[PDB]
Amino acid sequence: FSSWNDYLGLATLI
Amino acid sequence: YDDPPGLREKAEYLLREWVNLYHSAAAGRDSTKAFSAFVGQMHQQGILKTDDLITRFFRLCTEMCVEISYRAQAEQQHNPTMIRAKCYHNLDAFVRLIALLVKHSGEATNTVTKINLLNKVLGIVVGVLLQDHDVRQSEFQQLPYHRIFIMLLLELNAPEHVLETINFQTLTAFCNTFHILRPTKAPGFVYAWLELISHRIFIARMLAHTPQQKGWPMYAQLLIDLFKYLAPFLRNVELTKPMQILYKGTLRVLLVLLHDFPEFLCDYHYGFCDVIPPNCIQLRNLILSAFPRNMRLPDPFTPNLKVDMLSEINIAPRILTNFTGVMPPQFKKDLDSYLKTRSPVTFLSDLRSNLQVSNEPGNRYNLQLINALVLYVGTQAIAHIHNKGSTPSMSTITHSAHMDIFQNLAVDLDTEGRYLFLNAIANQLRYPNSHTHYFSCTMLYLFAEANTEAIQEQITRVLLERLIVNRPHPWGLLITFIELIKNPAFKFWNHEFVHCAPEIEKLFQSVAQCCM
């Protein structure tokens, strides 16, 4: 990841 | 043997007659006349004459019940829950006899002889158990003794006046008995023992029924016995499958205590963490996630949460363990000296010199001493800052003897030592309190003031491994992690160990799935 928001923008279910 | 002749026949007759009575008479005047008649007959047969005869009576009864259990199992295996019901037929009968003899022993107000009789019988049963364990060895069966103990416990915890006037002492007797039968002393009884100490009613009476919480230290002692027995097995990863049963029992009782008695797990978190091996992330997490129910934890994902402005932050948690004693006297004196005068600086290299015991990988350090050192230095630091007229922060915990010790441990220790140290810090990352806050700031500062990425990646991986576990999670842990990741001052994402690795990314995804 590259940042905090980038980390929160993860797509786990896919 | 050493038994008087003809006594076995007396005991046999009496036991059988009492079983018959127990399974023939109903509650009311019948039970009372039956017990009275039976006691009278016990006096007639001259068994209550001397203490020795009473002892041998209870012992013979116990032995006969046990032999009936064995014979019942055998007869079961020979002829293809009913057998259970036979064993329990005789056993429950005998238990009823014991409880009734204890309840009506001496006067109504005289509790002394009642408790004495209880401890006497329990002791005798313990003796029979240990003898049977030493002789039968592999053929040993836990079921009868388990039945006796739990049914006696249930009987003596009945809603009755006489029984309630002696309840705590009854619980005391049973606690002592359970402690004597600890798995390190009676391995062949460990499953039944675990069943006994993790029984819901026993737990209820120990952790709630008694005021002043006099029952908490005792049950804490039982749990610590359990963890002490389990530690070397839980430490070795090749014994995961054979230890599934005991591990699941321990997990179960820890879950029970977490959901129904969190205050207890709070007050005794340090001793438990001290005994439980650091690789047991789940159990330890259950112990660390516990917080007082009269406290409301703020959401860690709250937009700009002011942690320092929380009311419970300045308050210290209660530690019911003397961690100071782990430190040797001279080392403690030198420690206090350096904490007071910040001199000499050699005391730090001497610190590594004092924490390490061996050069063997995995067993290099004294874990308890490290935990104690970390917690003590932390608390002393909090008190020191409070005495200066301020609260712990990122700019108030720095440049002092305490932080000197912390940073020195952060650099001079090897990877193993660093791991144990960082873990010793993380064990205090819990619900909002002074310890949680101070050690959060300490962890984050150690990350920030680091001169190499080694300790940084190590910290990150510690938080990561402590977060990948079933909900709930310790508040301070999640807070520390979130602060490390979100606050641009720590520049977390600009480091190399997180830039390249897809492994630590996988870990981050797991943490996102478990905690987010």
Author numbering:
A (entry chain D): 40 to 53
B (entry chain C): 1842 to 1921, 1926 to 2361
Kindly provide excerpts from the paper associated with this entry:
Nanos is a conserved post-transcriptional mRNA regulator that was first identified as being required for posterior pattern formation in the Drosophila melanogaster embryo. Although the Nanos partners vary depending on the organism and mRNA target, a common emerging partner is the CCR4–NOT deadenylase complex, which interacts with the N-terminal region of Nanos proteins in diverse organisms. The CCR4–NOT deadenylase complex plays a central role in post-transcriptional mRNA regulation by catalyzing the removal of mRNA poly(A) tails, repressing translation, and promoting mRNA degradation. The CNOT1-C region contains the NOT1 superfamily homology domain (SHD), which interacts with CNOT2–CNOT3 heterodimers to form the NOT module.
To this end, we crystallized the CNOT1 SHD (residues 1833–2361) in complex with the NIM peptide of Nanos1 (residues 40–56). The CNOT1–Nanos1 crystals contain two molecules of CNOT1 sandwiching two Nanos1 peptides between them. The other Nanos1 peptide (chain B) contacts the helices of the final HEAT-like repeat of CNOT1 (chain A, α22 and α23). Because this helix arrangement is conserved in three independent NOT1 structures from three different organisms, it is unlikely to be the result of crystal contacts. In contrast, helix α23 displays two additional turns in the structure of the CNOT1–Nanos1 complex and moves by 43° relative to its position in the human NOT module (salmon helix), which results in the opening up of the Nanos-binding site. The first eight residues of the Nanos1 peptide form a turn and a short α helix that lies almost perpendicular on top of the CNOT1 helix α23, thereby covering the hydrophobic pocket. More specifically, three highly conserved aromatic residues (namely, F40, W43, and Y46) insert deep inside the CNOT1 pocket, where Y46 forms a hydrogen bond with the backbone oxygen of CNOT1 F2353. The orientation of the turn is fixed by the invariant residue D45, which provides two intramolecular hydrogen bonds (one to the backbone amide nitrogen and one to the hydroxyl group of S41). The other invariant NIM residue, L49, is located at the end of the short helix. This residue makes hydrophobic contacts with A2357 of CNOT1 and packs against Nanos1 F40 and Y46, which most likely results in the stabilization of the overall conformation of the peptide.
